[PDB]
Amino acid sequence: MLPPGKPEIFKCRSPNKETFTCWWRPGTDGGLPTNYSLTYHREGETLMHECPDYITGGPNSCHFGKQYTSMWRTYIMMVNATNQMGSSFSDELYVDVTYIVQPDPPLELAVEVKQPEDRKPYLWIKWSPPTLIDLKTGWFTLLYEIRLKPEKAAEWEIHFAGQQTEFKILSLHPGQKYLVQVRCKPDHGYWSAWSPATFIQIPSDF
Amino acid sequence: MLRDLFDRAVVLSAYIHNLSSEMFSEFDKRYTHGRGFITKAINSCHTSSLATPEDKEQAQQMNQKDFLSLIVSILRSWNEPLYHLVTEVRGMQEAPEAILSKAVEIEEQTKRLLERMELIVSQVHPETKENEIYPVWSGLPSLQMADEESRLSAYYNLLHCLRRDSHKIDNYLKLLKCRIIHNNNC
Numbered sequence: 001m002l003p004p005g006k007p008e009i010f011k012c013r014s015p016n017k018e019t020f021t022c023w024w025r026p027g028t029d030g031g032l033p034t035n036y037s038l039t040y041h042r043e044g045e046t047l048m049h050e051c052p053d054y055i056t057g058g059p060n061s062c063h064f065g066k067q068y069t070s071m072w073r074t075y076i077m078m079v080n081a082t083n084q085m086g087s088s089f090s091d092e093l094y095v096d097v098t099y100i101v102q103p104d105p106p107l108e109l110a111v112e113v114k115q116p117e118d119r120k121p122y123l124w125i126k127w128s129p130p131t132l133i134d135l136k137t138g139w140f141t142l143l144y145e146i147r148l149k150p151e152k153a154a155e156w157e158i159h160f161a162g163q164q165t166e167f168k169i170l171s172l173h174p175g176q177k178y179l180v181q182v183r184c185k186p187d188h189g190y191w192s193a194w195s196p197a198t199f200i201q202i203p204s205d206f
Numbered sequence: 207m208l209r210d211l212f213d214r215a216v217v218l219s220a221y222i223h224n225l226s227s228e229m230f231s232e233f234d235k236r237y238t239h240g241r242g243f244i245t246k247a248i249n250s251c252h253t254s255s256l257a258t259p260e261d262k263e264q265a266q267q268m269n270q271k272d273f274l275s276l277i278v279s280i281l282r283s284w285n286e287p288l289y290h291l292v293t294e295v296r297g298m299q300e301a302p303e304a305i306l307s308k309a310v311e312i313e314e315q316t317k318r319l320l321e322r323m324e325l326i327v328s329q330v331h332p333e334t335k336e337n338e339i340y341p342v343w344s345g346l347p348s349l350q351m352a353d354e355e356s357r358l359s360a361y362y363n364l365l366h367c368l369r370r371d372s373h374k375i376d377n378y379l380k381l382l383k384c385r386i387i388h389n390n391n392c
């Protein structure tokens with residue numbers, strides 16, 4: 001017997017500046033929606049468009065493939081929540097793909113102990129970028145940070161690796177096991193989630 | 207030495223975008239968070255009228271000489287508004303200090319970037335017809351109007367446009383560095 005309450009587009013994110021996805025939530029305190037429709041227009045155009053893909057982003061999401069995504073151009077979007085008693089519209093949300101970039105975590109974090117003759121020994125960390133980022137053309141630029149700590153230590157040691165995909169750490173405590181994680185951000189944008197940890201035992205003879 | 211030039215250029219451009227981002231955020235949170243200034247920002251940039259690539263594929267389609275010259279037009283077009291932004295802000299008695307310092311730094315760094323760009327073009331494309339055709343900014347009366355709301359909104363749009371354009375210049379310089387130096391195997 002109630003129309004939907006007022007829905008909210010609460011987040012958008014682009015993982016690679018080539019596609020993006022936005023997510024909404026239904027308002028509490030109205031009735032159950034039976035449909036949502038996300039519409040938008042773009043700065044400098046009058047054409048109104050519907051969300052091009054309601055499936056890929058899962059529940060209550062709009063995903064914009066490559067053919068609907070461009071940088072440097074505001075999207076003005078709105079979602080409505082409808083049922084047989086009526087309808088409710090979100091606030092318009094102003095989004096620029098340029099400012100919502102957050103990559104997925106780096107992949108294949110691997111770690112090794114290296115003990116060279118009379119050069120300082122070291123921990124060798126290596127990893128790869130998330131898939132579907134285009135670094136090779138210079139479209140996308142990725143910066144990385146490593147953190148590592150033994151269990152029960154109160155602080156992580158953080159090392160900024162800039163754009164390298166490998167790094168060397170000196171003077172770890174001999175005999176201690178370390179948890180190592182890597183994360184990445186665009187040149188301009190948000191840090192990814194930390195990768196899952198890799199574990200490494202630093203040998204006694206270090 | 208192309209590689210040292212590109213490297214310095216990309217340092218300046220990525221730094222200019224940083225400063226512009228921070229200036230806009232400090233202006234926004236302090237002067238305009240209290241209304242639909244965002245709604246007024248729509249379609250209002252003086253470089254709008256230029257033919258700029260909007261996605262990776264368009265950037266790859268551009269020939270390189272026209273792409274470099276494009277970056278140079280965009281940067282030459284910002285000479286004027288950055289001058290006025292600094293002049294106007296500096297001449298207030300209660301000038302927001304954090305904002306003023308970034309604007310002065312951007313104004314100076316933008317000159318240094320443009321010099322680099324001019325070196326890069328004469329190294330990579332020595333023949334280029336020297337001929338300026340960049341778009342004109344003519345927004346000074348609005349920055350000067352006594353009506354505070356119209357004034358703050360003209361500042362909002364200028365800063366919003368600068369944050370956009372610096373980001374775009376940085377990104378296009380990064381595409382070009384990778385194209386010209388590394389045949390797109392950065």
Ligand SMILES: [Cl-]
Pocket residue numbers: 189190191
């Ligand atoms: Cl972040």
Ligand code: NA
Pocket residue numbers: 013014015019020021063064
């Ligand atoms: Na996406």
Ligand code: NA
Pocket residue numbers: 054055058059060061062
């Ligand atoms: Na959906």
Ligand code: NA
Pocket residue numbers: 018065066067068069070261
């Ligand atoms: Na696209």
